[PDB]
Amino acid sequence: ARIAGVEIPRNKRVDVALTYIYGIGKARAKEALEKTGINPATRVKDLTEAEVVRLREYVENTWKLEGELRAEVAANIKRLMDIGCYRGLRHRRGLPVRGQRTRTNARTRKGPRKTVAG
Amino acid sequence: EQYYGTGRRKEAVARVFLRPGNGKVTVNGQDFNEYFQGLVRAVAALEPLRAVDALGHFDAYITVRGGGKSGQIDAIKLGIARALVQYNPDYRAKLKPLGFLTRDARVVERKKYGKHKARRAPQYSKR
Amino acid sequence: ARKALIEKAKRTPKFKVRAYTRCVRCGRARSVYRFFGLCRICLRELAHKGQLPGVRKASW
Amino acid sequence: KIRIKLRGFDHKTLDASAQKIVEAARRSGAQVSGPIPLPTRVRRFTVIRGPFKHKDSREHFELRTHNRLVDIINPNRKTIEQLMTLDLPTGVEIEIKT
Amino acid sequence: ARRRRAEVRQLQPDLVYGDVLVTAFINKIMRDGKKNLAARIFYDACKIIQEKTGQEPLKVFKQAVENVKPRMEVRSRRVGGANYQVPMEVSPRRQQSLALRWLVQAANQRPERRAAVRIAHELMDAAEGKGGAVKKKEDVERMAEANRAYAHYRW
Amino acid sequence: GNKIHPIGFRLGITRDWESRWYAGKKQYRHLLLEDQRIRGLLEKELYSAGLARVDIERAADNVAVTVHVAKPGVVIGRGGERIRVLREELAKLTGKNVALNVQEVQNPNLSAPLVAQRVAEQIERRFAVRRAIKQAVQRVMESGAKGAKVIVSGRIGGAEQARTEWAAQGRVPLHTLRANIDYGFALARTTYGVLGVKAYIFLGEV
Amino acid sequence: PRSLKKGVFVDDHLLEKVLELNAKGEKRLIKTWSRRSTIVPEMVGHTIAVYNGKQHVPVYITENMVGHKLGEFAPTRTYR
Amino acid sequence: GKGDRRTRRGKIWRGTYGKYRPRK
RNA sequence: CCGGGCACUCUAACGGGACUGCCCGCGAAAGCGGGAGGAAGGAGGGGACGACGUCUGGUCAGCAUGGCCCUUACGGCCUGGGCGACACACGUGCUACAAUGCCCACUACAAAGCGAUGCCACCCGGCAACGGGGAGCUAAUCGCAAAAAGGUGGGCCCAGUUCGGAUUGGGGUCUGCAACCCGACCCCAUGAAGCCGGAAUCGCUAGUAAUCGCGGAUCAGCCAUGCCGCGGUGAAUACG
Ligand SMILES: [Mg+2]
Ligand SMILES: [Mg+2]
Ligand SMILES: [Mg+2]
Ligand SMILES: [Mg+2]
Ligand SMILES: [Mg+2]
Ligand SMILES: [Mg+2]
Ligand SMILES: [Mg+2]
Ligand SMILES: [Mg+2]
Ligand SMILES: [Mg+2]
Ligand SMILES: [Mg+2]
Ligand SMILES: [Mg+2]
Ligand SMILES: [Mg+2]
Ligand SMILES: [Mg+2]
Ligand SMILES: [Mg+2]
Ligand SMILES: [Mg+2]
Ligand SMILES: [Mg+2]
Ligand SMILES: [Mg+2]
Ligand SMILES: [Mg+2]
Ligand SMILES: [Mg+2]
Ligand SMILES: [Mg+2]
Ligand SMILES: [Mg+2]
Ligand SMILES: [Mg+2]
Ligand SMILES: [Mg+2]
Ligand SMILES: [Mg+2]
Ligand SMILES: [Mg+2]
Ligand SMILES: [Mg+2]
Ligand SMILES: [Mg+2]
Ligand SMILES: [Mg+2]
Ligand SMILES: [Mg+2]
Ligand SMILES: [Mg+2]
Ligand SMILES: [Mg+2]
Ligand SMILES: [Mg+2]
Ligand SMILES: [Mg+2]
Ligand SMILES: [Mg+2]
Ligand SMILES: [Mg+2]
Ligand SMILES: [Mg+2]
Ligand SMILES: [Mg+2]
Ligand SMILES: [Zn+2]
């Protein structure tokens, strides 16, 4: 069931299977099922060509999505990076941005542990 | 006419009134099986009457309050016990050997400082 | 603590946020109970003396 | 409606003052509902024992404000003849709301 | 138990059967203090085990727990260097405890999705003389009869 | 590190507060501050007059400051003169229109804070502390007082190392709160250092 | 996720200074000890020296960096 | 579970309100 | 809800009640085993209480204090910054790795506390944080308030997922003079590691462990997952 820029969920509930699209979580899936007038509990296989085409109509152009969204986020990174912003420096050095402590437990942003001696 | 038993269990109070009848017991505007629906220990509430062969000889109305529903069930048990004793004192001969007239005094123990919940001590590592 | 560091008593802090408790007797810098206006050490000693009515030994 | 809100840090003081008031009002007035007790406001304060740690040594104290109610019914003069100012207790505190 | 004998707790009887071993097993199933959910597990398992095989769940439960109880085991004793595995018999109370623990642990190590289904099929297999709990029991007994060369270290 | 304050233990039973009144959320703070100011003033001036306890009571803007003295002649003064100055200076700090009250305490050696003050005085002029201790315990024991106890702090007699003094008599059971155990602390500030003086006195049973 | 939610706050200090500086043409280096204030559009083109807490570092203000604050370009920290 | 802030349990653990846990 | 009434649950002040007193046994005695009666027993359960002293234990950075150094200066005000830094290492925790589970509606049962511009029922606006309006409670009467696990109903179907919520992009509210350094919170989106943990090591013997929520102090706000209390359900085992 192709909906957005290449995206094919299958064999699951529709609202759940829409999370597999990039710019769609649970909220936007519920909104699509709401305004498109489609039963959320339906399986992917049982989707009508008209139901699929209406879901495509809505989801395709209401919000920016997979390729545009990835490029927009990455270009936002580049945007606040080329400026001399401190946030850009935190993105450069590969350190957390939201203002956490970096003495311990910066693992998610800094990668696997590289243990120097002491 | 009517006989009264109060009972108390783990911060619960279950006023129990016993009369003759068919065996229908109601609680706070609900039948005994609708308010305690799907609780496997609910049958213990009407257990004290199985040494006296009630439930067909008797009938009840109970008002319970406080704590959780398990304490409610056990307070109902104790209240039925005391109502049964005030009805017929000879029932004591079949009650205390079963143990239905004893107030269960097990209370939740207060929380102490230096602990997590009143006994659990925080874990140390490399003493 | 320090005398000048009880400058909160003349409050006029130039901004309403800069008001801190500053326990009256000991001039506590960090930990002050607002209800007594005292700090835990001053509260302990004063409750030991018996100058705070109603204060007993908690036990249960 | 004459509400007499009694409050204090001492329970025996509240009992003394309230019973004196009720004994004064019992020689003049009605079947007075009398000394009803109200729940007590409990303020607890936990304090670390020693300055400069030993964190896990703290002890706590508790203040308790006790409350009593009188509710005299149909008093006219002789009740307030023994009411104006006759009481000994100091730590007691009395309010009158109508 | 340095001073006293540590008197055994006397469990409450059961509301359905009136038997104490059922309450003990229901306690062994309970986790996080949920005796209601554990009782529902055990009794839906009772219905399933009484339907899938046309026998009474009472005697099947009893026969399974009886089949899982071992008669010998091993304890480590420090003698002349490193300790050795010394076999010995079992207390009836400890037999009960070990049987119920092996029952629950072999039931939850099963593939079945629902808990009650695991409990029911575990009880069935144990009542027939096979299954995982009886396998652990027979391994415990195989520890005996094997290091029996240390039968002079009984203590 | 043990032996919490005894009067803090005793506050509930067989002991009473130095201030007994009532307040609420909006009043307790500066009222307690006012009590502290009163006790501060009375410890500034009346130290050498032999004062033991200051009991302050409030009904409703009425203050009842009660000074227990071992020598009321210095508090009243000649012709009442001294009950004019510091009784007005008392009202020149608090605008509550407060009056002052005096009371007699018998046997200044029977009040523990007074005994503490006495031993601290004899320490400041550098007497052998143990003689003051045993003599104080005897002054206590020579008039009822089924128990008596005195503790002195370190740097005794000016010694470099700190020590701990002793010589109680009778029976002084600080552990059990039954029998009206009184306690007083004094501070001897001397050239070598500071000496704490703890006077425990045990009298009565119930 | 950054929010000021109404009347975006800019301190008077550099506000009046720069709105009077613009009237006479672009000025050279300015003095700034207030990094609490927000950047406004008309600041583009100047050269603003901000305080690290120790030093005075010049910053070239451009159109791209209008929505941010003065101090995003003055690093307090010094490492490696 | 409790750390998922856009679920109901994560809302009651933080004590907040929103779309996934309306007040009433 | 009303009339009305205190019997009841309750609130809070004084009492009664347990003493190995009764009986069998054993014993020289204390006492021990067992049994009845009793709400309860052999210290019924929990506190407050920590001996002569010890380690030259801890803080003059709370206070007070003995000596030695400071004086356009260590004192003193204010702005900014810092205590939040990171290639690492431990301690204490929080959340998890799921089906006895998650989420969604629906519904029931706590105790202890807090609140005069402070808590904020209720109506409106907004997906929401929150805003506007506004009632009441000097609070056993009002409000925080909904307890949560649980109950029935439903969907999920063993899968890095309707598990898990880290990280990051954007939008927005709020306290505050002011959120770059460096706040909480809401919304959209992104949906990382992790599928029960190596050697080793910790807590707990009865309502205890385990789990579930609630409140409080400090505080304009809050980095509280801490700390101090409260109750809901409720074990396993102790040969020695
Ligand atoms: Mg309790
Ligand atoms: Mg608990
Ligand atoms: Mg430690
Ligand atoms: Mg100083
Ligand atoms: Mg502040
Ligand atoms: Mg503060
Ligand atoms: Mg601590
Ligand atoms: Mg003294
Ligand atoms: Mg001497
Ligand atoms: Mg005493
Ligand atoms: Mg989730
Ligand atoms: Mg009425
Ligand atoms: Mg009566
Ligand atoms: Mg016996
Ligand atoms: Mg017996
Ligand atoms: Mg017995
Ligand atoms: Mg006891
Ligand atoms: Mg005891
Ligand atoms: Mg006891
Ligand atoms: Mg004792
Ligand atoms: Mg020392
Ligand atoms: Mg040191
Ligand atoms: Mg000094
Ligand atoms: Mg720090
Ligand atoms: Mg480096
Ligand atoms: Mg409501
Ligand atoms: Mg009332
Ligand atoms: Mg009411
Ligand atoms: Mg009232
Ligand atoms: Mg289901
Ligand atoms: Mg993986
Ligand atoms: Mg997922
Ligand atoms: Mg899995
Ligand atoms: Mg123990
Ligand atoms: Mg707060
Ligand atoms: Mg943070
Ligand atoms: Mg909390
Ligand atoms: Zn202080």
PDB file of N, CA and C in Angstrom, chain A residues 1-65:
ATOM      1  N   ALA A   1       0.826  -1.202   0.000  1.00  0.00           N
ATOM      2  CA  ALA A   1       0.000   0.000   0.000  1.00  0.00           C
ATOM      3  C   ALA A   1       0.864   1.257   0.000  1.00  0.00           C
ATOM      4  N   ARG A   2       1.117   1.803  -1.189  1.00  0.00           N
ATOM      5  CA  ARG A   2       1.960   2.983  -1.324  1.00  0.00           C
ATOM      6  C   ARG A   2       1.149   4.242  -1.043  1.00  0.00           C
ATOM      7  N   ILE A   3       1.654   5.083  -0.138  1.00  0.00           N
ATOM      8  CA  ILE A   3       0.942   6.293   0.263  1.00  0.00           C
ATOM      9  C   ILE A   3       1.763   7.534  -0.063  1.00  0.00           C
ATOM     10  N   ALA A   4       2.926   7.664   0.562  1.00  0.00           N
ATOM     11  CA  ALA A   4       3.766   8.841   0.430  1.00  0.00           C
ATOM     12  C   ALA A   4       4.935   8.536  -0.502  1.00  0.00           C
ATOM     13  N   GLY A   5       5.911   9.445  -0.547  1.00  0.00           N
ATOM     14  CA  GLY A   5       7.211   9.121  -1.105  1.00  0.00           C
ATOM     15  C   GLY A   5       7.632   7.784  -0.536  1.00  0.00           C
ATOM     16  N   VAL A   6       8.347   6.971  -1.316  1.00  0.00           N
ATOM     17  CA  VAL A   6       8.199   5.516  -1.288  1.00  0.00           C
ATOM     18  C   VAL A   6       8.012   4.984   0.127  1.00  0.00           C
ATOM     19  N   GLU A   7       6.894   4.288   0.335  1.00  0.00           N
ATOM     20  CA  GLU A   7       6.425   3.881   1.658  1.00  0.00           C
ATOM     21  C   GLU A   7       5.362   2.815   1.457  1.00  0.00           C
ATOM     22  N   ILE A   8       5.635   1.594   1.902  1.00  0.00           N
ATOM     23  CA  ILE A   8       4.715   0.481   1.666  1.00  0.00           C
ATOM     24  C   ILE A   8       4.539  -0.311   2.957  1.00  0.00           C
ATOM     25  N   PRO A   9       3.565   0.035   3.792  1.00  0.00           N
ATOM     26  CA  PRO A   9       3.225  -0.814   4.937  1.00  0.00           C
ATOM     27  C   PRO A   9       2.297  -1.944   4.511  1.00  0.00           C
ATOM     28  N   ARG A  10       2.182  -2.948   5.379  1.00  0.00           N
ATOM     29  CA  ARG A  10       1.466  -4.151   4.980  1.00  0.00           C
ATOM     30  C   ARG A  10       1.031  -4.952   6.200  1.00  0.00           C
ATOM     31  N   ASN A  11      -0.124  -5.608   6.065  1.00  0.00           N
ATOM     32  CA  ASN A  11      -0.548  -6.714   6.918  1.00  0.00           C
ATOM     33  C   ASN A  11      -0.761  -6.309   8.373  1.00  0.00           C
ATOM     34  N   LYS A  12      -0.954  -5.024   8.649  1.00  0.00           N
ATOM     35  CA  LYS A  12      -1.154  -4.536  10.007  1.00  0.00           C
ATOM     36  C   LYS A  12      -2.352  -3.595  10.031  1.00  0.00           C
ATOM     37  N   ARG A  13      -2.624  -3.026  11.202  1.00  0.00           N
ATOM     38  CA  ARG A  13      -3.637  -1.985  11.297  1.00  0.00           C
ATOM     39  C   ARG A  13      -3.149  -0.721  10.602  1.00  0.00           C
ATOM     40  N   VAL A  14      -4.085   0.000   9.980  1.00  0.00           N
ATOM     41  CA  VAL A  14      -3.716   1.102   9.094  1.00  0.00           C
ATOM     42  C   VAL A  14      -3.073   2.240   9.877  1.00  0.00           C
ATOM     43  N   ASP A  15      -3.721   2.680  10.958  1.00  0.00           N
ATOM     44  CA  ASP A  15      -3.168   3.771  11.757  1.00  0.00           C
ATOM     45  C   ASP A  15      -1.798   3.408  12.315  1.00  0.00           C
ATOM     46  N   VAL A  16      -1.614   2.145  12.698  1.00  0.00           N
ATOM     47  CA  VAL A  16      -0.305   1.682  13.141  1.00  0.00           C
ATOM     48  C   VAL A  16       0.668   1.630  11.971  1.00  0.00           C
ATOM     49  N   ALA A  17       0.212   1.127  10.820  1.00  0.00           N
ATOM     50  CA  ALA A  17       1.086   0.985   9.665  1.00  0.00           C
ATOM     51  C   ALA A  17       1.506   2.327   9.075  1.00  0.00           C
ATOM     52  N   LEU A  18       0.812   3.417   9.419  1.00  0.00           N
ATOM     53  CA  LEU A  18       1.198   4.739   8.938  1.00  0.00           C
ATOM     54  C   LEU A  18       2.372   5.328   9.708  1.00  0.00           C
ATOM     55  N   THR A  19       2.622   4.853  10.933  1.00  0.00           N
ATOM     56  CA  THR A  19       3.802   5.285  11.674  1.00  0.00           C
ATOM     57  C   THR A  19       5.081   4.957  10.918  1.00  0.00           C
ATOM     58  N   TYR A  20       5.045   3.923  10.074  1.00  0.00           N
ATOM     59  CA  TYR A  20       6.212   3.548   9.289  1.00  0.00           C
ATOM     60  C   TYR A  20       6.578   4.601   8.252  1.00  0.00           C
ATOM     61  N   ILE A  21       5.670   5.530   7.947  1.00  0.00           N
ATOM     62  CA  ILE A  21       6.040   6.686   7.142  1.00  0.00           C
ATOM     63  C   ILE A  21       6.865   7.638   8.003  1.00  0.00           C
ATOM     64  N   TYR A  22       7.748   8.398   7.355  1.00  0.00           N
ATOM     65  CA  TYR A  22       8.685   9.232   8.098  1.00  0.00           C
ATOM     66  C   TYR A  22       7.953  10.274   8.937  1.00  0.00           C
ATOM     67  N   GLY A  23       7.266  11.205   8.288  1.00  0.00           N
ATOM     68  CA  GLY A  23       6.678  12.315   9.011  1.00  0.00           C
ATOM     69  C   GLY A  23       5.339  12.032   9.661  1.00  0.00           C
ATOM     70  N   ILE A  24       5.070  10.772  10.000  1.00  0.00           N
ATOM     71  CA  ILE A  24       3.799  10.379  10.601  1.00  0.00           C
ATOM     72  C   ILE A  24       4.074   9.507  11.817  1.00  0.00           C
ATOM     73  N   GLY A  25       3.548   9.914  12.962  1.00  0.00           N
ATOM     74  CA  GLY A  25       3.534   9.117  14.176  1.00  0.00           C
ATOM     75  C   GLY A  25       2.160   8.539  14.440  1.00  0.00           C
ATOM     76  N   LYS A  26       1.778   8.505  15.717  1.00  0.00           N
ATOM     77  CA  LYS A  26       0.437   8.051  16.065  1.00  0.00           C
ATOM     78  C   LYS A  26      -0.586   9.171  15.921  1.00  0.00           C
ATOM     79  N   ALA A  27      -0.202  10.397  16.283  1.00  0.00           N
ATOM     80  CA  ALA A  27      -1.124  11.527  16.214  1.00  0.00           C
ATOM     81  C   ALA A  27      -1.533  11.819  14.777  1.00  0.00           C
ATOM     82  N   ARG A  28      -0.555  11.936  13.879  1.00  0.00           N
ATOM     83  CA  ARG A  28      -0.887  12.225  12.491  1.00  0.00           C
ATOM     84  C   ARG A  28      -1.602  11.053  11.830  1.00  0.00           C
ATOM     85  N   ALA A  29      -1.313   9.822  12.257  1.00  0.00           N
ATOM     86  CA  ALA A  29      -2.057   8.673  11.751  1.00  0.00           C
ATOM     87  C   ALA A  29      -3.517   8.736  12.180  1.00  0.00           C
ATOM     88  N   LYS A  30      -3.768   9.070  13.448  1.00  0.00           N
ATOM     89  CA  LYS A  30      -5.147   9.201  13.900  1.00  0.00           C
ATOM     90  C   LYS A  30      -5.850  10.343  13.177  1.00  0.00           C
ATOM     91  N   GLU A  31      -5.131  11.439  12.907  1.00  0.00           N
ATOM     92  CA  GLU A  31      -5.720  12.559  12.173  1.00  0.00           C
ATOM     93  C   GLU A  31      -6.046  12.177  10.734  1.00  0.00           C
ATOM     94  N   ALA A  32      -5.167  11.408  10.092  1.00  0.00           N
ATOM     95  CA  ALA A  32      -5.436  10.958   8.732  1.00  0.00           C
ATOM     96  C   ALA A  32      -6.652  10.044   8.697  1.00  0.00           C
ATOM     97  N   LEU A  33      -6.696   9.055   9.595  1.00  0.00           N
ATOM     98  CA  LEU A  33      -7.860   8.178   9.672  1.00  0.00           C
ATOM     99  C   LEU A  33      -9.125   8.951  10.032  1.00  0.00           C
ATOM    100  N   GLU A  34      -8.984  10.055  10.768  1.00  0.00           N
ATOM    101  CA  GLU A  34     -10.131  10.871  11.152  1.00  0.00           C
ATOM    102  C   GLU A  34     -10.701  11.622   9.954  1.00  0.00           C
ATOM    103  N   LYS A  35      -9.880  12.458   9.318  1.00  0.00           N
ATOM    104  CA  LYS A  35     -10.379  13.333   8.261  1.00  0.00           C
ATOM    105  C   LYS A  35     -10.547  12.623   6.925  1.00  0.00           C
ATOM    106  N   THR A  36      -9.912  11.466   6.737  1.00  0.00           N
ATOM    107  CA  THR A  36     -10.078  10.700   5.511  1.00  0.00           C
ATOM    108  C   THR A  36     -11.314   9.808   5.546  1.00  0.00           C
ATOM    109  N   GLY A  37     -11.933   9.645   6.713  1.00  0.00           N
ATOM    110  CA  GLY A  37     -13.125   8.830   6.841  1.00  0.00           C
ATOM    111  C   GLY A  37     -12.868   7.362   6.583  1.00  0.00           C
ATOM    112  N   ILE A  38     -11.915   6.787   7.311  1.00  0.00           N
ATOM    113  CA  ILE A  38     -11.522   5.395   7.137  1.00  0.00           C
ATOM    114  C   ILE A  38     -11.510   4.719   8.500  1.00  0.00           C
ATOM    115  N   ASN A  39     -11.966   3.473   8.540  1.00  0.00           N
ATOM    116  CA  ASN A  39     -11.930   2.685   9.761  1.00  0.00           C
ATOM    117  C   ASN A  39     -10.482   2.442  10.170  1.00  0.00           C
ATOM    118  N   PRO A  40     -10.067   2.863  11.369  1.00  0.00           N
ATOM    119  CA  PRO A  40      -8.664   2.647  11.763  1.00  0.00           C
ATOM    120  C   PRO A  40      -8.308   1.184  11.954  1.00  0.00           C
ATOM    121  N   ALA A  41      -9.233   0.373  12.465  1.00  0.00           N
ATOM    122  CA  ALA A  41      -8.945  -1.017  12.795  1.00  0.00           C
ATOM    123  C   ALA A  41      -8.843  -1.925  11.576  1.00  0.00           C
ATOM    124  N   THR A  42      -8.959  -1.387  10.364  1.00  0.00           N
ATOM    125  CA  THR A  42      -8.883  -2.213   9.167  1.00  0.00           C
ATOM    126  C   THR A  42      -7.456  -2.691   8.923  1.00  0.00           C
ATOM    127  N   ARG A  43      -7.343  -3.870   8.317  1.00  0.00           N
ATOM    128  CA  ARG A  43      -6.053  -4.371   7.873  1.00  0.00           C
ATOM    129  C   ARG A  43      -5.594  -3.617   6.626  1.00  0.00           C
ATOM    130  N   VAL A  44      -4.286  -3.677   6.365  1.00  0.00           N
ATOM    131  CA  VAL A  44      -3.732  -2.991   5.201  1.00  0.00           C
ATOM    132  C   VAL A  44      -4.230  -3.633   3.910  1.00  0.00           C
ATOM    133  N   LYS A  45      -4.344  -4.963   3.894  1.00  0.00           N
ATOM    134  CA  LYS A  45      -4.741  -5.668   2.678  1.00  0.00           C
ATOM    135  C   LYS A  45      -6.155  -5.304   2.241  1.00  0.00           C
ATOM    136  N   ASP A  46      -7.049  -5.041   3.191  1.00  0.00           N
ATOM    137  CA  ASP A  46      -8.453  -4.784   2.894  1.00  0.00           C
ATOM    138  C   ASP A  46      -8.729  -3.338   2.500  1.00  0.00           C
ATOM    139  N   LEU A  47      -7.694  -2.522   2.319  1.00  0.00           N
ATOM    140  CA  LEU A  47      -7.898  -1.115   2.000  1.00  0.00           C
ATOM    141  C   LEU A  47      -8.375  -0.953   0.562  1.00  0.00           C
ATOM    142  N   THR A  48      -9.461  -0.206   0.393  1.00  0.00           N
ATOM    143  CA  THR A  48      -9.991   0.077  -0.931  1.00  0.00           C
ATOM    144  C   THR A  48      -9.001   0.921  -1.727  1.00  0.00           C
ATOM    145  N   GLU A  49      -9.046   0.771  -3.053  1.00  0.00           N
ATOM    146  CA  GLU A  49      -8.282   1.668  -3.908  1.00  0.00           C
ATOM    147  C   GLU A  49      -8.734   3.111  -3.721  1.00  0.00           C
ATOM    148  N   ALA A  50     -10.017   3.325  -3.415  1.00  0.00           N
ATOM    149  CA  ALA A  50     -10.484   4.680  -3.137  1.00  0.00           C
ATOM    150  C   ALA A  50     -10.031   5.151  -1.759  1.00  0.00           C
ATOM    151  N   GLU A  51     -10.072   4.267  -0.758  1.00  0.00           N
ATOM    152  CA  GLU A  51      -9.548   4.622   0.559  1.00  0.00           C
ATOM    153  C   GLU A  51      -8.053   4.908   0.492  1.00  0.00           C
ATOM    154  N   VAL A  52      -7.300   4.060  -0.214  1.00  0.00           N
ATOM    155  CA  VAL A  52      -5.864   4.289  -0.368  1.00  0.00           C
ATOM    156  C   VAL A  52      -5.607   5.588  -1.120  1.00  0.00           C
ATOM    157  N   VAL A  53      -6.407   5.871  -2.152  1.00  0.00           N
ATOM    158  CA  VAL A  53      -6.170   7.088  -2.921  1.00  0.00           C
ATOM    159  C   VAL A  53      -6.507   8.325  -2.092  1.00  0.00           C
ATOM    160  N   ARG A  54      -7.519   8.251  -1.219  1.00  0.00           N
ATOM    161  CA  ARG A  54      -7.837   9.398  -0.366  1.00  0.00           C
ATOM    162  C   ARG A  54      -6.774   9.604   0.708  1.00  0.00           C
ATOM    163  N   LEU A  55      -6.274   8.508   1.285  1.00  0.00           N
ATOM    164  CA  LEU A  55      -5.157   8.617   2.214  1.00  0.00           C
ATOM    165  C   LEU A  55      -3.946   9.232   1.530  1.00  0.00           C
ATOM    166  N   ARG A  56      -3.709   8.867   0.269  1.00  0.00           N
ATOM    167  CA  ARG A  56      -2.623   9.483  -0.484  1.00  0.00           C
ATOM    168  C   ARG A  56      -2.877  10.970  -0.687  1.00  0.00           C
ATOM    169  N   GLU A  57      -4.101  11.332  -1.085  1.00  0.00           N
ATOM    170  CA  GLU A  57      -4.458  12.740  -1.242  1.00  0.00           C
ATOM    171  C   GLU A  57      -4.119  13.537   0.009  1.00  0.00           C
ATOM    172  N   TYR A  58      -4.546  13.048   1.175  1.00  0.00           N
ATOM    173  CA  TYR A  58      -4.315  13.804   2.402  1.00  0.00           C
ATOM    174  C   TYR A  58      -2.840  13.787   2.788  1.00  0.00           C
ATOM    175  N   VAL A  59      -2.292  12.600   3.061  1.00  0.00           N
ATOM    176  CA  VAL A  59      -0.956  12.501   3.644  1.00  0.00           C
ATOM    177  C   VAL A  59       0.099  13.071   2.702  1.00  0.00           C
ATOM    178  N   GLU A  60      -0.055  12.843   1.394  1.00  0.00           N
ATOM    179  CA  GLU A  60       0.965  13.257   0.432  1.00  0.00           C
ATOM    180  C   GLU A  60       1.264  14.747   0.534  1.00  0.00           C
ATOM    181  N   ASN A  61       0.235  15.590   0.459  1.00  0.00           N
ATOM    182  CA  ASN A  61       0.429  17.040   0.573  1.00  0.00           C
ATOM    183  C   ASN A  61      -0.492  17.582   1.670  1.00  0.00           C
ATOM    184  N   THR A  62      -0.091  17.433   2.914  1.00  0.00           N
ATOM    185  CA  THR A  62      -0.588  18.309   3.959  1.00  0.00           C
ATOM    186  C   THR A  62       0.590  18.720   4.834  1.00  0.00           C
ATOM    187  N   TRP A  63       1.545  17.801   4.980  1.00  0.00           N
ATOM    188  CA  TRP A  63       2.764  18.015   5.740  1.00  0.00           C
ATOM    189  C   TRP A  63       3.962  17.612   4.895  1.00  0.00           C
ATOM    190  N   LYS A  64       5.093  18.245   5.180  1.00  0.00           N
ATOM    191  CA  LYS A  64       6.341  17.846   4.551  1.00  0.00           C
ATOM    192  C   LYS A  64       6.768  16.482   5.079  1.00  0.00           C
ATOM    193  N   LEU A  65       7.360  15.675   4.206  1.00  0.00           N
ATOM    194  CA  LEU A  65       7.521  14.246   4.460  1.00  0.00           C
ATOM    195  C   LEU A  65       8.923  13.806   4.044  1.00  0.00           C
TER     196      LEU A  65
END
